[PDB]
Amino acid sequence: AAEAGITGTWYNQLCSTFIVTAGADGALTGTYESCVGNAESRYVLTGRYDSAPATDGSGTALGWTVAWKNNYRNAHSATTWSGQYVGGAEARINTQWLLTSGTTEANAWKSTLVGHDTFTKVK
Amino acid sequence: AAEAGITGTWYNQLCSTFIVTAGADGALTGTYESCVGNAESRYVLTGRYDSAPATDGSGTALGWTVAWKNNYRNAHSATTWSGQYVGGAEARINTQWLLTSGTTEANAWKSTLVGHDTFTKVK
Amino acid sequence: AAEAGITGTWYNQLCSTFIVTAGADGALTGTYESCVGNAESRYVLTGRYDSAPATDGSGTALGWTVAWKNNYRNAHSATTWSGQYVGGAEARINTQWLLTSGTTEANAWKSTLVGHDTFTKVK
Amino acid sequence: AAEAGITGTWYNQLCSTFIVTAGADGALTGTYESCVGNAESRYVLTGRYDSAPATDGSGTALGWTVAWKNNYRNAHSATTWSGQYVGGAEARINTQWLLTSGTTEANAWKSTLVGHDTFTKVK
Ligand SMILES: O=C(O)CCCC[C@@H]1SC[C@@H]2NC(=O)N[C@@H]21
Ligand SMILES: O=C(O)CCCC[C@@H]1SC[C@@H]2NC(=O)N[C@@H]21
Ligand SMILES: O=C(O)CCCC[C@@H]1SC[C@@H]2NC(=O)N[C@@H]21
Ligand SMILES: O=C(O)CCCC[C@@H]1SC[C@@H]2NC(=O)N[C@@H]21
């Protein structure tokens, strides 16, 4: 149910696009495009999901990472999204994220932004 | 420098073990073993790192995910670590993490733990 | 504008109630009632807000704390909300929060939940 | 034990100073001085702590807020620290924090930094 539900195109609350394949082994592979920040076009993502989730109505735990380097830009930063997939007619991936920039040691205290993204199958 | 510095075995501040290969393409692949929580033995990890970091003394941004399912246990949860690699004689990976459990919608507000891990090359 | 806008009753996305007075000195004082977790009735809150915010269209930074002890219950925990007030016809307080429980040292790694609350003037 | 243990001067891992009084009613009052960021001299803090903590060896949950406005500077930002006090010969306040800046709606996704501070009675 989770494998067959996660694979595809997802859209966050504004204008970012998350394209993912959920493998039978628990792998997440695809691309991410952010409409905000120091980013242009698609970036590689990889992650993991629970490939045997509970059947009690609980969501499916997952996470993925994007390092913000591609052929066009390098922001010297990486975001991880940690969350859960919720199935049904209004399917959702509800996440919180951590965006860490490469910094000097003196600036390390301010290296990491935190936020949240909600993904849907329709933009 | 970052590719040649990240690959290997890392140990957190207590008793967890992070085994990773940093690929030329920006990939992180390996295994994680936690000495705490609902976990036993090794779990698959995958992630991304900045494969062309700044040369100004800044750290190398990275992140990875573990879904807490293996052949022994399934915690129905996933952790993402977001952080930076700092090179030199006392090499470090400094991270913050988000641990999301699969929950019901009613319990989603309490789905996610936050913390921090510091990894070194010596335990 | 911020002082005259923050004072009053606020409601989160589900069923919690945030009653606050914004003082001229930057103080936040009031009570919080949560409809979830180990909580019953009202709890004291105190916090701070920027009493001279920017006039460029930016929000007003603020934060507050609740320790989850009152005359009825003690959860041995505390939540801090950090966020910004956004004025106008659809006024909002957009927050992220950290909920720390008192733990043993062995369990400290799992002491802290993270989430987000959006408050409006209408439930 | 917690009331008699929290009151006083605390120092973080680098060069910040946290001066606090823990009241019998659960109040935290005092001043904070940061050696980093857009900050100079002392700022008002207020917070809450569990004034009847568990006696089983668990820490004492607490939190506080600083809005980064004083007579010298206004950063248009606020930090909340959420954590626990650990008593004994090497007393500690272990915290995680959220630093929210006032932003435009377009920039709200990057409003909030996350980190951690460990406070001791000796610098
Ligand atoms: O500016 C950077 O360092 C790289 C781009 C970051 C974009 C962030 S990732 C979290 C949030 N969700 C999005 O879709 N975009 C932003
Ligand atoms: O209990 C679970 O849900 C699975 C195990 C979680 C272990 C966590 S991940 C973050 C922290 N760092 C570690 O090395 N272990 C804990
Ligand atoms: O269970 C506890 O430890 C005390 C109650 C916690 C309620 C939390 S605080 C963050 C979130 N927002 C709410 O309104 N309620 C929950
Ligand atoms: O730059 C600002 O917006 C105001 C100063 C922020 C200082 C932060 S608060 C968290 C961390 N701990 C400290 O002692 N200082 C920094």
Residue numbers in the entry:
A (entry chain A), B (entry chain A), C (entry chain A), D (entry chain A): 12 to 134
From the paper:
Streptavidin is a 66-kDa, homotetrameric biotin-binding protein first isolated from the bacterium Streptomyces avidinii. The streptavidin–biotin complex has an equilibrium dissociation constant of 4 × 10–14 M, one of the strongest non-covalent interactions found in nature. When biotin is absent, this loop appears to be highly flexible and dynamically disordered, but it closes upon ligand binding, further burying biotin in the pocket.
The crystal structure of oxidized M112 in complex with biotin shows that the detailed geometry of the M112 disulfide bond differs from the prediction provided by Disulfide by Design 2.0 arising from a steric clash between the sulfur of Cys-26 and the oxygen of the backbone carbonyl group of Leu-25. The electron density corresponding to the side chain of Leu-25 is very weak and suggests an increase in disorder or conformational flexibility for the side chain in addition to a shift in its position away from the well-ordered contacts formed in the biotin-bound state of wild-type streptavidin. Additionally, the hydrogen bond between the nearby residue Asn-23 and the biotin ureido oxygen is lengthened to 3.7 Å compared to 3.0 Å in wild-type streptavidin; the disruption of this hydrogen bond has been predicted to be an early step in biotin dissociation from molecular dynamics simulations. Comparing the structures of wild-type streptavidin with the oxidized form of M112 suggests that the rigidity of loop 1–2 and the formation of close contacts between biotin and the loop, especially Leu-25 and Asn-23, make important contributions for binding affinity. The much slower rate of disulfide bond formation in M112 compared to M88 is likely related to the strain induced by disulfide bond formation and the destabilizing conformational change required for loop 1–2 to accommodate the formation of the new disulfide bond.
